[PDB]
Structures are given as structure tokens and as C-alpha cells.
Amino acid sequence: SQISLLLLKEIYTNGSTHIMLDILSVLAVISGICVIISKNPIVSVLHLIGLFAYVSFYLILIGLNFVGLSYLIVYIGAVSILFLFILMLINIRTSELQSNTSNSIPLTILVGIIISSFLFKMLPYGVIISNQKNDLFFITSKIWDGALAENNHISSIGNIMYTNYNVWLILASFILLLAMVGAIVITIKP
Amino acid sequence: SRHIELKYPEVFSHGSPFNVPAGFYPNLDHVIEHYRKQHLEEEERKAKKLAAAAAAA
Amino acid sequence: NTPTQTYQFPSKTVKTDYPLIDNDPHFTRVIRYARPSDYAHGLAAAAAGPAALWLMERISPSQVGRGGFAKAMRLAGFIGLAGGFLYFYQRSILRFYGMSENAREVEMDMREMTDRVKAGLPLYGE
Amino acid sequence: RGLFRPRPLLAGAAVLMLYGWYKLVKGIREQNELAREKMWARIHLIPLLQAEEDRDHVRRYLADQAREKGLLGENIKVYNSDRYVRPTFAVTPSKPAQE
Amino acid sequence: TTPRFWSTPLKYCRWAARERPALFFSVVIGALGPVTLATVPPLRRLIGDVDAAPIPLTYPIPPGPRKQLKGYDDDTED
Amino acid sequence: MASGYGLNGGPSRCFPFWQELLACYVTNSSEDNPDGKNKCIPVMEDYYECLHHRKEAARVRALQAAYREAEAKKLQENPPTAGQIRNLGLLNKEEDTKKVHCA
Amino acid sequence: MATRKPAFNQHVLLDTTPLPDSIPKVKEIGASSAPLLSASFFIGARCKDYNDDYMQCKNENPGRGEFECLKEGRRVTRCARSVLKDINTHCLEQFRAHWQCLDNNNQQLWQCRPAEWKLNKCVYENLKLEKVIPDQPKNSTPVHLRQRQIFAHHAIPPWERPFIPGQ
Amino acid sequence: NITLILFLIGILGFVLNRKNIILMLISIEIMLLSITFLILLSSLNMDDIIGQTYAIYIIVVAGAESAIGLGILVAFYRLRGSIAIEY
Amino acid sequence: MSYSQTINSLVEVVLVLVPSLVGIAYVTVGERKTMGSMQRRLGPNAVGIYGLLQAFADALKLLLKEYVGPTQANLVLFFLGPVITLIFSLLGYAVIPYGPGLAVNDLSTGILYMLAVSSLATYGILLAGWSANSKYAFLGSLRSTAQLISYELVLSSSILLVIMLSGSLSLTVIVESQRAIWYILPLLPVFIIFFIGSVAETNRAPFDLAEAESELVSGFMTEHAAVIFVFFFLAEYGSIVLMCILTSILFLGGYLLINAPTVEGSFYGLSLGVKTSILIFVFIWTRASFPRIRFDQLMSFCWTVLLPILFALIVLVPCILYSFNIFPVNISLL
Amino acid sequence: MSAMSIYIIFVSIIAILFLAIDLIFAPHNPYKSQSRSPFNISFFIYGLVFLLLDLEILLLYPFAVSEYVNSAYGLAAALIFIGIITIGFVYELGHDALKVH
Amino acid sequence: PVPFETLIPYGIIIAMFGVTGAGMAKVRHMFNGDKRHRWSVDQWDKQQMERDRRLTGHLRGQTDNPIAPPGFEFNNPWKVXXXXX
Lengths: 190, 57, 126, 99, 78, 103, 167, 87, 334, 101, 85
Hints:
This is part of a larger assembly, with eleven protein chains of eleven kinds. Chain H has three helices and no strands. By secondary structure, chain H is mainly alpha-helical.
């Protein structure tokens, strides 16, 4: 007659609230919408930077710290600075960049229904597990042999990045090389 | 052909050597024996070609 | 002392004409098993680079300034040396692969590797 | 003034660098030796910790199979293999404990 | 005036050290990596400075068959 | 996934399923008998189940409905409190351990 | 319950159902992290074979090691239990000094050498167990037997001496 | 699912845009971030460091491609004086 | 745990931020007194006993002063950049260990976290200069942003060399690794470059074109009014202190010294403070000693001197670690 | 509620108070086309070389926390990667795209 | 001579670092139960602290009894979460 399954709140070692994942998700879409409806391209990039931050914070809260911090350092810290640099220098009249968005409204609706309906069916059950009574619960336990010397994610990447998959690293270096020589050749006087 | 031959059979040797749980990796002895036979068969085919068709000349 | 397991890893089998010696021979084996014609072919291949550039200059002059041709010859010499050496390495390693006639090599590997067994050495080193 | 001649400054810099690298060789080697001791200490504990966790997983897998056959009348087969897969989901009671 | 390296290499290196020190010694420092890779490990073996074995990063499974142990069985409990 | 390298520096949790799927294909499929790869169908399903957990999710929610249905039918005169629950298996709390276990 | 590291857990699920009677019962180890860390090398001394056997059994039974190795699982528990009773019978004071030092020192062994040297001497002359670390560099002194610890927050008293067994 | 909505937003950037080619670059960056976001969440579900490694290379390549595109736009602005299409 | 987790977290944050802001307040007081003594004068000795209230008077004056914004460009945007700059300049204090693990957040990626928050602080300067709606002022703010990202590369390149020795991004591990030796001795050129980069990173003299009124077009910081000046001033002096703390962590042994819990804690905090105060003094000393460097030459210094040397050291150091079998273990050890 | 989470709250609250004081107590009164010039290519180049070089450093940070495992083999590929990217830096210096003089 | 009024702010700065050091060490010590704290904790240490709690009730609690108490075999915490796996 006893209740063999027992459920109770965790006091310490608790963990963050999944509610915060919901606020970040709506902040990303609001900032994302503001990117493509903003009049001034500079303000558009500011909303884009905001979008990068929310995705970056999202990644940190689910435990993807190294990749999340890389977005902050690289996309916000380097890529979007380069974008703000060029935009803030070039001569721009907002009247010349503003089209009648109302003429695009039905195509906007149609494209959204068509693309979303097809693309959603492609998502594996893992990503759609917790989005839109009998709520399912994830359960985890410990291992000991698996936890003898844990790597942080950045160390697990470093284990394979230079040895097992180093062809990717060589290829990326060539792209970086080409980007460096190419952007210099087309912009500066010899 | 319907059967697919692996370009990279060495993928059977992939896997992290760290923090391995006991009894995690499935046994692959039939797989290695499969590729041992594939190698021994091919060497025999070359052996019975440049030693049998070479005695003519 | 046979290790009772003489084929420990799944390897890719490739159709070729000649017996496979080593699908990943050590750099020093490839140098040591090189034939004297490999040096001949590699050197002539290396010289071809700067010789072709010199021939283009004599028949179709580049009209370059005073020191330009020396600079291009320095780079052409390095390109030829790289390509000549890679071609030299390829000629030798193709016999290890069994992709080229390899009878002298099959004997030499059999001679060398049997000797390490009798010395208690690992077949491929430490 | 000798305080700003490069030669004694360069010599002084090199000795500090040479001393610091000599100490770094001694430090990292002993630190790598401490890591050897820490792992072997954990290694000796892993079987007794893992066996305790293995028994707990066995207990709860069986209790879940008893629940399913009692509740649903039989056991739904998730995997075709006979292997033990650690659960991703768990049946939970509708409410937590009161306090 | 300014030397050319392919004409007189030693004179160029002297000028570079005095005239472009940051770039010159950067080339020198970068080259010391490969040089120490080719010299120090060979010398350490000569002087007996042996490399430490890797520390375990997984449970060290013993090779060969199991040992067929008897002891601490269920009859030994309690 | 199938790579063999997990997040903590160990192997990936679905790798044994991937290795067995590849093992089944290599040793059952062939050019002489192409239909041997039909034996791999259950192993491929096990690999897809490890990645995404659809069948397991379908079982657990089917069972949880039944569990919560029966749990409502019964009457809990004195269910254990969280404080008693948090004292389960502790050195000097034998009373709470017996109460939680209903022994 | 998967080995995935949780990030949003707020609850714990416990099951009260015992093991079936078909499974022999073993009493679990009642020692916490600091005491069994200070007993780890002594467990490793007496129980190496059973520890290895239990891990070999599981490797022999991939995907099923939990269920097919319970008896060897029980033997590991009883051998480690025998060391913890033995130490608690002959070396309780030195045992407590070491793990209470460890429990105050981030469970780092190089911060408790004098207590460890005291206990290693006591364990050796009662239970004949030797701390052994495989593959230590032969040219140097073993790190756990060094008079000075470079990484110890407290410098070590010159009078406190490493215990070399058989000296 | 959030990654899907973000990919739509980047897609809609082209649909809602007749004259602003700077918004065209931004829409490509939103799509790349959306796809990288999807890879990262999937590799966390499948316990695979290779997915994280894939994300890192997309970030590098996306950064290198932004560099080239801003360079090409600068070589275009130098001769034109506008980034506006007269539509 | 013994008492409430929320209480514990509140007290730790109060224990770090409040003393840190008092420290920042007296760094600005100490900078004027030290430069005064070097200049054969006194410095503040009137506002408060011994001049110890001078920074508080300056802040209260500035907060009660009227603010002049742009020509109604955007009120939100005017404050956004200053708010961004200050928040992300103070965020880096959350991973500073005042003793082993004695940080608000004992993070395994702590070094990356400092690099991320610093690069978010650069945005406010760029954003503020744009909102000025002035061509000349924006070009100065743009030139300042160019200087900051360039010498950010210097600091990142320098930090990678320290991570190679420690094998860890955790700040506590980096300090505990230096019980072997302070990294200033084996990485002595890296420490000099990192200090130079931290002065340039903070817009400090001799890299102070941001605040240079004498130069014809420079000095956009000189146009920040009442509350905006407070924001940028505090962000800068909170960045100077953080840079000197991070330099002490990376090269000076952190909190390491040259039985009660309270006494041991006090000594570790005091040791870090002494090392940070010394580098704070050097920051002030260099500002009083040198003339300003031109923007073209400071960018040449970064790209043709500091970075070529650093990338040469990025080759040499791991080759040396491999050659002596001293690549450190990367497991959780110290 | 974690220390890091509380820390961000308090730091933001500090910024709010400072804004609050100056927007509440300080006196306020609303006191209250352009020409197009060419911009210097040097500023794009600074950001360009920064971004590509900042990407290369990020790809080396996993190596600094994985050296024990990488050993000789990882170092070789790390050195190859370093060698390739320093060549592009040599191109940047040699072509004086930082406007040396 | 020595201008000591110039040095007083440095003494304030050093002493503020001392307060953070002492205060942090004290509050952590009380939080862990009049015990020095843990730092650089990996997954193994985290699990060991949970096991200590299921023996004592405190994440820092210690015990050297070689026999587990009754109910220990049932109290091993399986953690439950809703979304992020």
C-alpha cells in the first residue's frame, strides 16, 4: 500500500530553472524581428548583436559554456564590430532603404506557413521534446568509471581537434588565409 | 551494386580512450576476422597470379 | 614468439597488382628502400621546374625589371624541389603499397622484418 | 649609470628566465606525479562505487518492469537488443512530497 | 645602403638585428621551437632524463583471462 | 551521435549502437547476398531509438498515465512528508526510514 | 536515469522497491568520500584482484554488465568492507587524523603527508598493506615519499618523516 | 523549434527587403546562427563533441565570410557612394 | 550546506562588489596623490581628512549635475552604451579568486569569461561615439575602438601562453600552478607585453588619445557630461583595477604569499591586494613619466612589434614544454 | 539563487540608481543637411585583421587545455596550423596594409 | 622624505582586498559547517558530495562506519528535469 515512487524538491545542488530558457527564446525572436523591420541599418545591427547575446546566454545555461563564450568573443566581439565599423562610416539615407513592407505581407504569410510546415517535420524528437497534463520528465543518474577524469567541453574538443579531425583544421586555416589575402587585395592601394 | 563497401573500415577503431565504462564497447572480433579474411584472400589472389601466370614466361 | 593475433585492426583492402608490403610505411623505410632510379627520376623532376621557367624566359621574355627573374627562379627552384621530392617519395612508397612492381622490396622487408623477430625486437619499433 | 645599460639588464633578465624555467620543470613534473597518485586513488575506488550504482540500477529496472506488467498488463519493448539502456525518461508521481 | 639577403646573407642578418629588431628576433624566436625539438629530446636521453609514463585516464583493464578468484562470496556475508 | 567522442572526454553514449549497426551490415550484407542487410533492420531501429528516444517516450507516458490513474484511486491516509523523505537512510533517523518504507 | 550532466533539475525521484529475494543481499559501504580516499590505496592493495575481476566480467558482457556481474559486484563490496573494518580495528586514530586532514584540505593528498605517513606506518605494521603507485619515474623519488611538497599550502615539518616500508 | 523560428526570421529578411542590401548580409548571418544553434542543441541531445566541433568551424567560416563580404561591399561603395538600390 | 543558499550568495556578492568599488574610489584618489608627489606637489588633502573624501565629492557633484544629451536623437541609445560599458567592466570581478576557489563563481572557463566580458565593454564606447551625432567625436571614438580590439589581441595572445603552462582556464588553477614559480620569471617577456597591452586596453597614458584635449581631433571622452562621465570614469577605473588584478593572477602568483579560517583568508586577500596595488602604482607611474604616442604609431607598435613577438613565443613555448616532458595534465588537480 | 545570478542583478541595479539620481534630482531643461566625406580604408583593415587573427587564437585555446593528451602528434598539427596562419600575417606586414609609413 | 598621505589610499586598497579574502573565507567556512570549502570540483567530486549527503544528510558530512545504515540502498538520488537534455 506504500508509495514506492517518491518525488521531492532538491535543496542544494539544485540547478537552474527552465523558465529562463523561455525568456531567452522570446527575446531572441523579438530582437530577430526587430532586425528585419528596423529602419536604420545601424540599429538593425544593434538588434542583431542583442540576438547573438541571447543565443549565447542560452548556450551557457544549458551547459555549453565554451561555445557560448566563443559567440560572445567572436561574433559580438569581432564580427559585429567590423559590421558597425563599416556601417557607421558609409553615407546612408534611411529613406533610400525603406520599402513598403505591406506589399510583402501575403508573401510573408505564405512563406512562413510553407517553410515552417516542411521544416518542422524534419526535427528529431530531441529538439521538439519540450515545445508545444502528461508531461514527460528527464531522469539522470551517476556513473563512476565514466567520471574518473572528466573533461570540460573545451578539453574534449581539444582532444580530437588537432589529431583525429585535423583535416578540418587545415581546411579552415586555408579559408582564413584566403579571407586575409582577399579582403586586403580588393580594398587597399598597392 | 547494392552492397556498400566501407571506404574507411578503420572507423571500427574510432572511439575515445578516456573515461571508458566497463563493458561499454561492443566486441569486434568477427568484424576484424571479416577484414582479416578479406586481406588474406586478396594476397592469395595476387600470389596465385604473379606466380602462376609468370611460370609461362 | 607469435603474438597469436597477427591482424589486430580492420584495414582497407585495395585491389592492386603486386603484394602489399606496408600500407603506412615509416618515412625512413621509404628512403631506405628507394631505388637509384628514384633518385634519378626525382632529381630530373626537380630540375624541370626552373628549367621550364628558364625556357619560357628565353623564348618568351617576361620583360621583368632588373632583379625580378632571380626572385622567380628562387621560387621555381623551391617548387621543383618540393615536387621533385614528393615524386621521389611516391615512386618508392608505391612499391610498399603494392601499386607498382615490388619484388626487390618484398624480399628486403621479409629479410629485415624476420631479423627483428629473431632479435626479439618489435616489428615496427617503439 | 649601470642601472640602465642593456648588457647587465639583459644578463639579469636571462638569469631570471633561466631560473624560472628550471623551477617550472621541477613544478610541472611533480604536479604530473600528483595527478598520477590522484587517478590511482580514484581507480581503486571505482569498482566499489560502480558495483553499488550497478545494484541500484538493477533494482530500479526490475521495479519499473514490475510496475509496467502490473499497470499495463505486459511490458512494452523499447529496444530489440537485450542490452541494458539507462532510462532517459521516468514515470513520476503527479505531485512532489508535501514539505 | 640597405643590404639584400640573397646577395650577402650574413650582412643582411646583421642589419636586420640592428634595424628591424622586432621582426628579426621574432624570426629567431620562432625558429628556436623546431631547433629545440631536434636537440633537447636527443640530449635528454643521453643524460638519462627519461620521459614519465602517461597517467591513467581510464580504468586500467588487465589483459588476459580472468583470475578465477575465490573469496568474499555470499557465504562470507554476515 | 555516432562519432565515438562524448561531451566529458569519454565515448559518445550511442556509439555502441552505431558500432553494432556497422558490424551487422559488414558481416551480413555482401554482393553475393544483398538481402542479408535486412538483418540489420532491428539494430538500425535501436540506433535511431538511442539518438531520439521516441519509442521510450511513448512507453513512459503510456505507463505514467496508468500510474497516475491508479494512484488517484488509492487513499493515502498518511503519505510521507518531504522532511521524513530527506531523512531516508540516515545514521540516527531509524524512525523516519521505517515510516517512509512503511515497514 | 542517464549519465548526462543535469542542468535544470529541481526534483529527485526515489524508488522504495527492494531487490528481489532471488538476488543475494550485500550490506553497502557506509564510508564517505574522505575516509575511503584515505583507505583507497589499502583497498587497492587487498582487493586489486576482485576489483579487476569485476571490471573484466563487465567487459566480457557488453551492454549487460550490470545484470550479469552482480555476484562479482558483491565480492568487491565485501573485500573493501574487510579493509575498512580492519583499519577501524587497528588504526582508527591515524585513520581519522588522515581523512579529517583530507576533508579540510580539498581532499588533496599532498596536503596531508604527515598524517598519511603516520597511517601508512600503522597500516603496514598491523595489516601488512603497502601503498603502491604504478609507473612512477625511476630517476626521482616517488612523489608521495618526498620530504617537501611544492604544492602544499603548509610547509611540512622537517621532523615528520616519510614512511618507507621495511626501513 | 526556436532554431526553426530564427531560420524563418532570416528567410523573411529577403522576403521583406527590396532595397537594403545590408539587411541581406544580416539575414545570411541570422540563418547561419540559426543552423549552428540547431546543430549545438542536437549534439547536446546526442552526447557528441563532434557536433560542437562542427559548430566551431561554422563560426570560423561565417566569420571569414563576413570579412570577405564586407570587403567586397567596401570595394563596391568606393566606386558608387550608396548601398541603396533605386527600386 | 549549513544556512540558506540565497543568503550565502548575497553575502559573497556584497563581500566582493562593495569593497571592490571602495578600492576603485581610492585608486582615483591615489592616482592624484601619487602623481602629485612625483610632481613635487601634494594632491587632494582638503576634501575629507587627508583628502580621503575627494572621490565621493567628485561623484556626488557629477550625479547632481545636469546632463545634455544629443539633439533628441534617441534617449535610450544615449544611455545604452554607457550602461553597457559599466556593467560589463564590473562583471569580470565575479571570477576573481580571493583565495582558492574564493570567487563569486569558481568557473572552469574563467579566463574565457574575462575575455568575453571585456569585448562586450568595447561596444559601449563605439555606441556612445555614434550617438554623439558629431563627425569629429565619432572618429575619435572609432579610433579608440580600433586601439581596444588590437591590444585585446595582444592580451589574448599573451594569455594563451599562460594557459599552456597551467593547462587550465580556471583562475584558481592558474594561481595554484604558480606554487612552483610565479610565471613572471619563466614568461618574463610575456608579462612585459601583457602589462603594456593592459595599459593600452584601458585607454591609459601613454595610450590616452581618448582623453587627450591637447591633440587637435582627439578627446571624445572629454565630452562626456554629468552622469555619462560617471559611467565611463567608473568603468575605466574598474577596468584598470581588474587589469592589475588579472596581471597579478597570471604572473605574480595571484593570492600566494611571499591556522584560523579568517586569518588565512585575510592574508590571501592582503597578498593579492599588495600585488595589485603595486601594479596600480606602476600604471600611475607610467602616466606621469611619458608623452603620448600617436595613433598611427601605437597601432604600428601593436601589429609590427608586439604581435610578431607573441606569435613567435606561441611557437617556442609548447615546443619547449614538449622537449622537457612538461606539458601539464589538464584534469582537475589544483 | 546563485552568486553569479545575484551579481548581475546588483551590478545592473548600481547602474539604475546612478541613472535614477541624475534623472530625478539633477536639474533638467531641454536646451536642444550634413556633408559626406570618404573614409579611411585603414579602419576596415584593422577590424579585418583583428577578426581573422582573433578567430585563429580561439582555435588554439582548446590546444592549451589539451596538451597532455595531444602530446607530440597534436603539437605537430597545432604547429602546422600556426605556420599557415603566420604566413598570412607575413602577407599583412609585407604589403603594409596597416599603413606603416 | 616619505610622503605617507600619498600611501594611505594604497593602504585602503590593500585592506579592501583583505576584507574580501577574510569575509569570503569565513562565510564559506560557515556554509560548509565550520569546515574549509571545496574548489576546482569536477564531476567525481560532485558525486562524492552527493554520496556523503545520502549517508549523513550534509553534502560535507563525513563518516567512517564500514556498514551503511538501513535505507541507504533506497535513497540514491535520481535527478528529474523537464526540458534540457
